[PDB]
């Protein structure tokens, strides 16, 4: 009849035996369709991808009978994969992954004439990638996606990327990142857990380049404005303490508060980053401005005009020199 073909195929078909039980390992090809790439969270060293994971192997026990109509493809319901052997492909970077069943369990299953199967189930994997926060506002992170088997050694199961396009993203447009080209290198990733054997592994590496725009609008402009404010504080030179000290005080305090606030979000990594270097240098320039005013006061309490003229001449030059060096080094 209609379903009698699949009933005949699955009768006497033990789902607890892999294809070619005593023969060669089954070659499973893997294809990934990134439906939506999520936002990477620097706080917890992780991001949330949403993929249409696809697998395709050869099962000789599932050859379609010669009485089957239709050219090649025999699609079945999503509620029938329970009776078919499936590779135990799991993600080695997952933190808390999830299935997807909004109306029915989202799993597709094609069967061809030669016995090939195609499971294209949908996942919501939440990977974790260790970031490198050196050169923080201008960095290019590489976040991975490791797929590997669990219960079968290399003698039984192995994963090979599809010869076409293993990744088929079309439009992503991350809020603060942009991915253009990625490498599928380390194709082979086979791990060797001690005393257990060789386990197949495949790996995809992305290149999450970070856009500078927000940070160039976030700290660069306010900090430059405060430094120029300190410069014009040099400019007046009224020798009035109540009008000259508060400018340097406000510059130093604003730099300190801005640094603390902007660093209160990133993960507590322990090494100097570009943002910290910039903040420290600008805060040091403000403090040096205040020390310059102090030395003017002590020398005036050879004249203060000469030293003030020298300062007004040299601090803008020194700041421009530092800015050029910083941008050239970090770009």
């Amino acid at each position: 009849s209609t379903s009698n073909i699949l009933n005949r195929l699955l009768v006497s078909y033990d789902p607890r035996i892999r294809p070619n039980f005593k023969g060669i390992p089954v070659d499973v090809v893997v294809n990934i369709f990134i439906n939506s790439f999520g936002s990477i969270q620097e706080t917890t060293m992780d991001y949330r991808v949403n993929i249409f994971l696809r697998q395709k192997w050869n099962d000789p026990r599932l050859k379609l009978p010669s009485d089957f109509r239709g050219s090649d493809a025999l699609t079945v319901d999503p509620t029938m994969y329970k009776c078919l052997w499936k590779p135990d492909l799991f993600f080695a970077n997952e933190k808390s992954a999830n299935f997807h069943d909004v109306t029915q369990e989202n799993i597709l299953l094609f069967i061809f004439r030669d016995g090939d199967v195609l499971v294209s189930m949908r996942l919501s994997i939440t990977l974790s990638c260790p970031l490198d926060l050196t050169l923080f506002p201008m960095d290019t992170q590489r976040c991975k996606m490791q797929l590997e088997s669990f219960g079968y050694t290399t003698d039984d199961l192995r994963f090979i990327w599809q010869s076409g396009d293993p990744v088929q993203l079309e439009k992503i447009a991350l809020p603060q990142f942009d991915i253009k080209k990625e490498d599928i290198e380390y194709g082979n990733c086979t791990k060797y857990y001690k005393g257990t054997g060789y386990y197949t592994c495949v790996e995809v590496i992305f290149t999450l380049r970070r856009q500078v725009g927000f940070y160039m609008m976030g700290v660069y402009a306010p900090t430059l404005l405060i430094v120029v404010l300190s410069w014009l504080s040099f400019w007046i030179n009224p020798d009035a303490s109540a009008a000259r000290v508060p400018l340097g005080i406000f510059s130093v305090l604003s730099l300190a508060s801005e640094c603390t606030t902007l660093a209160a979000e990133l993960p507590k990594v322990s090494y100097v980053k570009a943002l910290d270097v910039w903040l420290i240098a600008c805060l040091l320039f403000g403090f040096a401005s205040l020390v310059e005013y102090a030395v003017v006061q002590v020398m005036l309490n050879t004249a203060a005009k000469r030293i003030d003229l020298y300062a007004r001449a040299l601090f803008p030059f020194c700041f421009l020199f530092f800015n050029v060096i910083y941008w050239s080094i970090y770009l």
């Binding site: 936002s39 249409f52 696809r54 306010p222 030179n237 508060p246 406000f250 606030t261």
Partner: protein
């Protein structure tokens, strides 16, 4: 005519109904007319670019092997404990970003088999959909968030989705939202996907969402206007009060910096320039230029000795009469642009 016998005869053991083959198998694809009902909208997060909708998805296909002749009724009602033994479409929201059913005191499914073969099916889902936002005109944007109904198990030639002709997207009567206000017209386009494994079906609805201007306007424009007027009254003070003018300028600069930092902190770390960012930058620039022109006047007054004081007072008067005019010009120029 016992109800127990009739249900078993129509589906189950003594029926011959295989709930694994689609209606009209090996033939034309089966249409699935869909019509959602927005029970409760809202929870429009900005950071995660997602909104939570509580729909009531309905769909009615045509299964020819479910027709009955015993009961004279046409709109026969069935059990939410029975529809697990009949074939159903498997539409999934392509941007669901997480979803869950609802089960309180019983499941939340409705089944209604018609006389000819039409089968109504209405479940209650609570999606948390994802829609990318364009925050260029952030305080006055008109967002467009969408949902994409689409199956997962069949090909284009096996299962057709269409919207209902009349009244496809209904809305709860007393629905209201914070901030945004939901429009009346809802576009119903086609979103048919071409994946690597064949052409698949995709029907989508568009909800056009405006943004109310009250909270943003008040809480991030009135303080800015007040601080700018404070800078102007800093202009309108004695020239000799150097510490007073310096302190007032410093306070205005600090207030603008803090307000800009606070305004930037409620939105995702987007790259481009927003609409409120231009306003905050211009206000900060005006405050800084005000303090800088005070600094220039103070420098000029120091370095004909009497002529320098006269020109310093002239510059101060020109500033006090011109700045406010320039700010008014900027205000009109800005408001006329972001309202068109």
């Amino acid at each position: 005519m016992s109800p127990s016998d009739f249900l078993d005869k129509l589906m189950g053991r003594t029926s011959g109904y295989d709930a694994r083959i689609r209606p009209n198998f090996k033939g034309p694809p089966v249409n699935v007319s869909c019509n959602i009902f927005i029970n409760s909208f809202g929870s429009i997060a900005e950071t995660t670019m997602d909104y939570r909708v509580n729909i009531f998805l309905r769909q009615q296909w045509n299964d020819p092997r479910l027709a009955y002749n015993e009961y004279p009724d046409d709109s026969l009602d069935l059990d939410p404990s029975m529809l697990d033994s009949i074939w159903k479409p498997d539409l999934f929201f392509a941007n669901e970003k997480g979803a869950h059913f609802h089960e309180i005191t019983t499941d939340n499914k409705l089944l209604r088999i018609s006389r000819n073969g039409n089968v109504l099916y209405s479940i209650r889902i609570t999606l948390t959909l994802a829609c990318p936002m364009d925050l260029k005109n952030f305080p006055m944007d008109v967002q467009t968030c969408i949902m994409q109904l689409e199956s997962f198990g069949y090909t284009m030639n096996d299962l057709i989705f269409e919207w209902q002709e009349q009244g496809a997207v209904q809305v709860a009567d007393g629905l209201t939202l914070p901030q945004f206000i939901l429009k009346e017209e809802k576009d119903l386009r086609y979103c048919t996907k071409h994946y690597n494994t064949g052409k698949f079906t995709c029907i989508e609805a568009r909800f056009h969402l405006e943004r109310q201007m009250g909270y943003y306007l008040i809480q991030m424009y009135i303080p800015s206007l007040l601080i700018v007027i404070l800078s102007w009254i800093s202009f309108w003070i004695n020239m000799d009060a150097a510490p007073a003018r310096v302190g007032l300028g410093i306070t205005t600069v600090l207030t603008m910096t803090t307000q800009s930092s606070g305004s930037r902190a409620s939105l995702p770390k987007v790259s481009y320039v927003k609409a409120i960012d231009i306003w905050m930058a211009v206000c900060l620039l005006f405050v800084f230029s005000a303090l800088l022109e005070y600094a220039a006047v103070n420098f000029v007054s120091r370095q004909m000795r009497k002529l320098f004081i006269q020109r310093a007072k002239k510059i101060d008067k020109i500033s006090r009469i011109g700045f406010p005019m320039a700010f008014l010009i900027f205000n009109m120029f800005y408001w006329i642009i972001y309202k068109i």
